[PDB]
Amino acid sequence: IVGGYTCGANTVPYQVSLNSGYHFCGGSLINSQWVVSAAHCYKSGIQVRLGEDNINVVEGNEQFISASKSIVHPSYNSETYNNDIMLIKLKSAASLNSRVASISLPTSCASAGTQCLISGWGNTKSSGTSYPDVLKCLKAPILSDSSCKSASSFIITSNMFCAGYLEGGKDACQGDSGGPVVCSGKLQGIVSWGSGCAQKNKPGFYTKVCNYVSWIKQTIASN
Numbered sequence: 001i002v003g004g005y006t007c008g009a010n011t012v013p014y015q016v017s018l019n020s021g022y023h024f025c026g027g028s029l030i031n032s033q034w035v036v037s038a039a040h041c042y043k044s045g046i047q048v049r050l051g052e053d054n055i056n057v058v059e060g061n062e063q064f065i066s067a068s069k070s071i072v073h074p075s076y077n078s079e080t081y082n083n084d085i086m087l088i089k090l091k092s093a094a095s096l097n098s099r100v101a102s103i104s105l106p107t108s109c110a111s112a113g114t115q116c117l118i119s120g121w122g123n124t125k126s127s128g129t130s131y132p133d134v135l136k137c138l139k140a141p142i143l144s145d146s147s148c149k150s151a152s153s154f155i156i157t158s159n160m161f162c163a164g165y166l167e168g169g170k171d172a173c174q175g176d177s178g179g180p181v182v183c184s185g186k187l188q189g190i191v192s193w194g195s196g197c198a199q200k201n202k203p204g205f206y207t208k209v210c211n212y213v214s215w216i217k218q219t220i221a222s223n
């Protein structure tokens with residue numbers, strides 16, 4: 001997260017860190033046994049870390065739980081990032097409390113202009129690199145579909161929205177991948193892609209979760 005602020009410990013209780021020896025992606029807890037992340041975060045050897053603030057210090061509210069199953073969206077396209085969404089089942093159910101909580105799935109899609117909360121342990125710099133150990137947060141508006149298309153020379157589908165600041169300076173970044181975009185208490189986005197971070201006219205692109213509620217619910221019900 002570039003140009004954001006320190007969330008505060010466990011203020012984003014649905015935020016998870018995906019760990020394979022080191023933090024490599026964010027994710028969102030949607031019930032006691034299931035995390036939603038980005039398909040581009042796919043790998044084996046994933047341990048899910050809940051209750052985290054400082055990812056380098058055991059602070060006392062963590063739960064570490066191995067993944068038993070990962071399901072990449074049937075139509076994920078790694079060239080375009082279309083359908084960049086993946087579900088992870090936990091080997092055991094997380095113990096839910098004020099610091100480890102699920103986030104509601106949306107009933108309707110969000111609109112352009114809504115300020116949403118984006119969070120993660122990703123790079124905090126637009127040029128060069130610096131990784132925080134505590135969770136970073138950012139409020140960013142959803143941009144109009146037309147504005148997003150005008151600002152990119154890459155494929156944009158109806159399964160994406162863009163959000164952020166066309167003047168640059170504030171955005172998600174590498175390491176925030178798979179993490180939440182929350183708008184009025186609903187999980188509306190997943191950190192997917194963008195050209196650099198926090199660059200002029202290069203806003204962040206996000207998987208549009210409202211298009212996938214059906215798939216998410218059916219998949220969880222049958223697995």
Ligand SMILES: N=C(N)NCCC[C@@H](NS(=O)(=O)Cc1ccccc1)C(=O)NCC(=O)NCc1ccc(C(=N)N)cc1
Nearest residue numbers: 079080154171172173174177192193194195196197204205
């Ligand atoms: N087909 C398309 N759409 N091509 C354009 C995007 C490709 C790629 N962009 S990229 O290489 O600049 C991503 C990047 C890598 C290292 C350091 C900073 C940023 C990219 O984003 N790859 C996936 C990725 O790295 N996702 C992580 C991510 C998360 C947030 C942002 C952001 N600025 N909001 C960017 C990348």
Ligand SMILES: [Ca+2]
Nearest residue numbers: 054057058059
């Ligand atoms: Ca910790």
Ligand SMILES: [Cl-]
Nearest residue numbers: 151152153195
């Ligand atoms: Cl571009």
